[PDB]
Nucleic acid binder design. Structure first.
Length: 928
RNA sequence: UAGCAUCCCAAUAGUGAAGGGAUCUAAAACUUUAUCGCCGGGAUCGCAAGUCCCGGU
């Protein structure tokens, strides 16, 4: 039933595919033994046998009777309704009538009730045959198949691809395979009309009719294999709820085309795998562990490639707005963008040095990591060279870059104080009372999140802690009523401590991690995990934990509980429980000692040219790679890298704190802001101190200014309006959400109110009022602009990672070709360098996704992922999009019914729009 | 293909290949303004999103 990822002899079993052979092994040891697992899976195969003989409704009496008759240890009416045969025993020298043994369990059960050794023999024979089949499947599951039939055919097709002879001659193989008769039989059976079962039966009939031809040649064997895959994909025998599978799927023409496409996809996957093996120099020895390490290295490299591509895009927006080199530079625009980024101003004489040091911080890392090899990570990350008509060489320790880096280092205390005041926990907690969290003797403020590969976010941890408290003996997580600004301050301070205080030392230290893991493991009694030793590093131990998780969701709950218990223990022990009781009402001493020399500036600048979300993604992947690593020098370099990411996170949200003098003038600000007013919401009381909106300044900083201006230029009555202004004054949002909480608690006490029409109408009206007020607030304070920028940047990063995959496969295939259409390259130049924000090509987001599908059409695993990425990103942003059929839109995917994802309240008729209908219109207009 | 994608192996060709595997592929899961009850079970959908009973606040 399931031969891997099962607990045999109290340990997980998994397959390791070597270059030759390929075996089943236990969780850790490398000893190649399939026989032990095959013998120990006897009970699982018995369960498979009973599930095969018993139909989908497994009624208890018949299931127990079958299990008792089948198993000696487990020994304790109509039959065909609960039933789901002529067979040959394994020890049959030849297949004929005299070895054609019976199976009619209905008659057997009727006879037994009238009163099954033959049935036991049938079960034993099936179990033995399935053991041998699974054993051979594992044994022949080599990495690069050569002696297998499919592997040999694939190798011949590789040879033809490398030469200029078209392989798998498809019309001829179809004609000599009798595809015409196959299609005629399938069409007749479909017209006659469990239709999938009948179509598969006719497929097997054609197989038996042409088996004397298809059993001797790999081309017909593989043709039948892909025909069977087509049948399972469109008319599944097992996946009943897939679709109807219309007669159009039976046409000779496109079944021909899909068979050819599957063969070509298999061939190209094989050639890219061979190129990967050649480039990584592991062709002689390919193991499961080696491929897992290569996969981790690949994923970290791809995340870093996306990060440095974002950095290159930001450098392009800073220096050369149109690109795909330094003479055309907008001095004023570069000065303004550099000021907005670095929170500091450079002179005109320093603009060339600034730009070229930015290039020397971004490009060399991209060049070093885009080439897949075992490279020294210290020499990869140090990067102390800045390149200057003529080319010179200076050092980042002799530029303004060092001064800015040291200013950020010294202002990290000031930056954390400013962020804490912006989220206003200062207004609730006293100075000396607050100071006792950064002054912990060992839990000093460190900007590294954690070496834990899967670091739970504060949102997830706090939500699960409230859920568990309301026995984990939790006493920290309480009062989840987000209406209270006291809770807002408490939540902000908890997030800050969690992210920049607790995890640093709770992850660089093993004792607290071990205590939390032990408590979480021993509370409930997550049986399939082991407790570590005192010398085991928590990073590597829980990297093993997450490896088990991503093979196999009990592991996510386990990790969340571990971090929850650790946070609770730290807060209780360090006398930090006062945060749970905010009371609204000097300076705070902030310890901050980090081991930064002048060699981290390059990564510092690259990080500074990224958004907070991309920086967090890069940090998470970097943590995963550091855990997967095994060298202490590289561990320290990635630790410094994580410290730099924390620096960027703390100083990323600096923004601007200037009046109309930030822009060119008052009229310039009016022109550039009314496109997205003189009253209180946008300008102060005096009418001449207009607050620079975070949305506007961020969208100008990240280069989405032109695209979002083009989007908001759709119509004039579409931005903030009198109705949006008035919706704020209609009611108090705090009172509205308090009433919603009261009504939710009322339905908590009595679910019957869900059937009361008046009460359900009142609750729906309250929900609609809350959603409308939140949308109106995001409109007046322009949070919609920020969210739209986040949407478009997330999409651009998704296509950038997809094109990183495309470039990886490109260079692998090129390397293998060397060892043995430019439209996609132009498309790479358009997408990977973020030229949409440039706007010269002028292709919408759906057009970009169609371009990504076109270039990534070389494999269906990415052709499908390109389409699914937009859907998943929009769903995670709170809105569902139903793509129209591609064949009806000339392969250019459009949008149909882009609707708000209805967060369901109380299967009932009440549902809350996670995003407003007007925001859905915004997203539709941006995409189209 | 739109939820189950993709790739590898698997010859008693009705023991249905109607098999197994994938940190070995790629999504995705994880990831610093929060309007969804939570935990602890059972049952059942190819399982997946989810569905129905059953319980404590």
């Amino acid at each position: 039933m399931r031969i891997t990822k099962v607990e045999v002899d109290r340990k997980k079993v998994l397959i390791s595919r070597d270059k030759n052979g390929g075996k089943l092994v236990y969780e850790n040891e490398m000893q190649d033994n399939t026989e032990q697992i095959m013998h120990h899976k006897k009970s699982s195969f018995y369960k498979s046998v009973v599930n095969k003989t018993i139909c989908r409704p497994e009624q208890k009496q018949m299931k127990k009777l079958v299990h008792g008759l089948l198993q000696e240890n487990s020994q304790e009416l109509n039959i065909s309704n609960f039933l789901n045969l002529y067979y040959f025993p394994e020890n049959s020298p030849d297949k004929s009538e005299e070895y054609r043994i019976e199976i009619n369990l209905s008659q057997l059960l009727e006879d037994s009730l009238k009163k099954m050794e033959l049935y036991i023999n049938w079960a034993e024979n099936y179990i033995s045959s399935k053991t041998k089949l699974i054993k051979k499947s594992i044994r022949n599951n080599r990495i690069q198949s050569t002696e297998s039939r499919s592997g040999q055919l694939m190798d011949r097709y590789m040879k033809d691809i490398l030469n200029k002879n078209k392989p798998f001659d498809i019309q001829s193989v179809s004609e000599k395979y009798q595809l015409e008769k196959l299609t005629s039989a399938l069409k007749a059976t479909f017209k006659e009309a469990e239709i999938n079962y009948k179509l598969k039966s006719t497929l097997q009939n054609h197989e038996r009719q042409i088996i004397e031809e298809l059993k001797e040649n790999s081309e017909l064997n593989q043709f039948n294999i892909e025909i069977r895959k087509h049948l399972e994909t469109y008319f599944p025998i097992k996946k009943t709820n897939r679709k109807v599978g219309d007669i159009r799927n039976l046409e000779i023409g496109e079944i021909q085309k899909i068979v050819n496409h599957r063969l070509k996809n298999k061939i190209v996957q094989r050639i890219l795998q061979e190129g990967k093996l050649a480039s990584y120099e592991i062709e002689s020895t390919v193991n499961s562990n080696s491929l897992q390490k290569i996969k981790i290295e690949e994923a970290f490299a791809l995340k870093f490639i996306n990060a440095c591509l974002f950095a290159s895009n930001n450098l392009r927006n800073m220096v050369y707005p149109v690109c795909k080199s330094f003479k055309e530079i907008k001095h004023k625009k570069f000065i303004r963008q550099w000021s907005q980024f670095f929170s500091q101003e450079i002179t005109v004489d320093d603009i060339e040095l600034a730009s070229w040091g930015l290039r020397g911080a971004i490009a060399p890392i991209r060049n070093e990591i885009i080439h897949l090899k075992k490279h020294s990570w210290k020499k990869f990350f140090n990067n102390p060279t800045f390149k200057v008509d003529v080319t010179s060489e200076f050092l980042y320790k002799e530029t303004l870059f060092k001064d800015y880096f040291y200013s950020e280092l010294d202002s990290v205390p000031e930056l954390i104080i400013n962020k804490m005041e912006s989220s206003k926990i200062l207004d609730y907690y006293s100075s000396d009372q607050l100071n006792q969290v950064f002054t912990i003797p060992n839990f000093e403020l460190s900007l590294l999140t954690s070496a834990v590969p899967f670091a739970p976010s504060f949102k997830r941890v706090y939500l699960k802690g409230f859920d568990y408290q309301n026995n984990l003996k939790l006493n920290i997580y309480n009062e989840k009523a987000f209406n209270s600004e006291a809770f807002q301050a408490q939540y902000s301070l908890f997030k800050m401590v969690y992210y920049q205080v607790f995890l640093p030392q709770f992850t660089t230290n093993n004792d607290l991690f071990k205590s939390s893991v032990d408590f979480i493991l021993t509370l409930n009694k997550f049986q399939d995990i082991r407790k570590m030793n005192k010398d085991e590093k928590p990073s590597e131990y829980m990297s093993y934990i997450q490896s088990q998780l991503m093979l196999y969701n009990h592991f996510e709950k386990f990790i969340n509980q571990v971090f929850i218990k650790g946070f609770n223990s730290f807060i209780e022990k360090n006398r930090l429980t006062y945060i749970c009781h905010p009371t609204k009402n000097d300076n705070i001493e902030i310890p901050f000692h980090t081991d930064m020399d002048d060699s981290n500036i390059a990564f510092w600048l690259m990080c500074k040219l990224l958004d907070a979300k991309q920086l967090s993604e890069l940090r998470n992947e970097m943590i995963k790679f550091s855990c997967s690593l095994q060298s202490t020098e590289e561990i320290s370099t990635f630790t410094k890298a994580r410290e730099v990411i924390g620096l960027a996170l703390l100083n990323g949200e600096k923004g601007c704190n200037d009046w109309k003098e930030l822009f060119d003038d008052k009229e310039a600000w009016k022109k550039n802001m009314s496109l997205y007013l003189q009253s209180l919401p946008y300008t102060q009381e005096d009418g001449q101190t207009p607050v620079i909106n975070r949305s506007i300044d961020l969208v100008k900083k990240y280069g989405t200014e032109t695209i979002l201006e083009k989007l908001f230029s759709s119509s004039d009555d579409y931005k903030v309006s009198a109705k949006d202004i008035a919706k704020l004054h209609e009611y108090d949002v705090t009172e509205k959400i308090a009433q919603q909480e009261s009504l939710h608690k009322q339905w908590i006490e009595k679910p019957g109110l869900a059937r009361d029409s008046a009460w359900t109408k009142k609750y729906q009206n309250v929900i609609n009022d809350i959603s409308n007020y939140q949308w109106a607030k995001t409109k007046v304070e322009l949070t919609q602009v920020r969210h739209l920028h986040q949407l478009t940047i997330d999409l651009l990063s998704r296509l950038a990672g997809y094109m990183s995959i495309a470039d990886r496969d490109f260079q692998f295939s090129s390397n293998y070709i060397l060892e043995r259409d430019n439209r996609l390259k132009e498309k790479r130049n358009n997408i990977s360098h973020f030229n949409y924000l440039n706007g010269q090509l002028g292709n919408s987001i759906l057009e970009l996704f169609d371009d990504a599908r076109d270039v990534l059409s070389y494999d269906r695993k990415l052709k499908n992922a390109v389409s699914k990425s937009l859907k998943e990103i929009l769903s995670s942003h709170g809105m569902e999009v139903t793509f129209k059929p591609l064949y009806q839109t000339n392969h250019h995917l459009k949008i149909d019914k882009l609707q708000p994802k209805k967060i369901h309240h109380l299967k009932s008729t009440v549902s809350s729009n996670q995003v407003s209908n007007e925001y859905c219109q915004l997203v539709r207009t941006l995409l189209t």
